[PDB]
């Protein structure tokens, strides 16, 4: 097939900024290249066809360009609604192939997370499993290090993270880390702690509880 | 008002078969090719199948991964586009989009989730994420619901039947080691409201016809 490579795969920009994404094909595709915007949990929206033709209704700040193998999309002045993932599509020769996509997100100031820890419910323990949940609320940038400490012992292999998309009001992220243990292992220990390292914090923050005490 | 209204899909076992449907309206369906395009969860877009108009003999083209297992077809009298999916494999699990590219537009359906697994549907367990009374007395407190061990996707979560939206984060589902999905939904509230206000998370899992309301209270000993 023809291979389509996008650059960069993700990027941040501030409102009003000029943004350019590039799209490179493994061979000449005769400007049969289309650009799509996909917002999370939504279907793709067509933006440009034949490298540079705007689909009716797309704001004029969107512009596409290129020829041969090398093409680009450009947003002259970024606006809040332009966030999402942009895909380019080669439709010269079947199979029509897409690029990996460029994630466009909005820049904002560092924000430190509010951290909360949640012990397993008694109800859940009745079934023999204990999930311990740590929440990092409303922070920026996305990178954060969360470590679980049980009776001063680091945990490995028994925790999963999940991260929301940028909040539509304050452009922050939130993250949840879920520590899973058997009820037997859970009840053999006292201090369950969540340690959060993040650029918005001068030092790591820790939230903890002792199994048993209200 | 162009629409591609999709129907079908859902949960189906490997080697099984499924038929997707797409009803077109508001453009000249018969003159244009029709397509199916896939998006595996969290991954990229991929072409599945193409079929041209009567004017081009209904020529069909397929991605290599599905060449002798899927069949694209159309009924121009009924404005219907179909994808007959046979000999299904785990890697066919994806969101499937009906797509029509026209002279000056390209229209995408809403997508139908196809999950290729032999497991039966499983409704969630909903457990409280409750704040202990350590919460800063004049600040903010967090609480939530842990929505655990369901299959397949998706679940939706609201708070107090949608009346509570501010400060809510419902996290993307996670695939656990057990092969069942799990997610949390949280909300931050004034610490002054723990005990005085009532927080109920409304969990809906359509594939299993499960609707669960869980009251989250601070906890006592
Ligand atoms: C009567 C007759 O003979 N018909 C032929 C099909 C051709 C009918 C008219 N052609 C199209 O609408 C094409 N659309 C565009 O160029 C614009 C565009 C491209 C990308 C994004 C947005 C807009 C192409 N049509 C698709 C296809 O043909 O699959 C394509 C190649 C993927 S784009 C037939 O039925 O054989």
Numbering used by the authors:
A (entry chain L): 20 to 233
B (entry chain H): 20 to 240
Task: Show the paper's wording.
Next, we determined the X-ray crystal structure of the PenG-Lys•MIL-3 complex at 2.2 Å. Three FAb molecules were present in the asymmetric unit (H (heavy)/L (light), A/B and C/D). In both H/L and A/B molecules, the phenylacetamide PenG sidechain and the thiazolidine moieties are well-defined in the electron density whilst the Cβ, Cδ and Cγ portion of the lysine moiety has weak density, indicating it is less well ordered and consistent with our observations by protein NMR (see above). The PenG phenyl group is deeply buried in a narrow hydrophobic pocket sandwiched on one face of the benzene ring by CDR L loops (Tyr68 L, Tyr110L) and the β-turn formed by CRDH3, mainly the side chain of Ile120H with some involvement of the main chain of Phe124H, on the other face (FigS10b). The interaction with Tyr68L has strong π-stacking character whilst the planes of the rings found in the phenyl moiety and Tyr110L are offset 70° and thus hydrophobic in character. The β-turn conformation of CDRH3 is stabilised by hydrogen bonds between residues Thr122H and Arg123H and Tyr 51H and Asp75L.The carboxylate of the thiazolidine moiety makes a bidentate salt bridge to the guanidine group of Arg69H and potentially a salt bridge with His54H; this binding mode is likely to powerfully contribute to binding enthalpy yet places the protons that are observable by NMR more remotely. The nitrogen of the thiazolidine ring interacts with a highly coordinated water molecule (W3) bridging CDRs H1, H3 and the lysine linker.
The best-characterised examples of unwanted immunogenicity from drug-protein conjugates are β-lactam antibiotics, such as penicillin G (PenG). As the electrophilic source of its inhibitory activity, the β-lactam group of PenG may also drive background / side reactivity with off-target biological nucleophiles leading to protein conjugation via primary amine-containing sidechains of lysine (and potentially other nucleophilic residues including arginine, histidine, and cysteine), as has been observed under some buffer conditions. Such protein-PenG complexes are the antigenic determinants of antibiotic hypersensitivity. Here, through systematic complementary biochemical, structural and clonotypic analyses of the relationship between the protein-conjugating properties of PenG and its immunogenicity in a mouse model, we now fully map the PenG-specific antibody response.
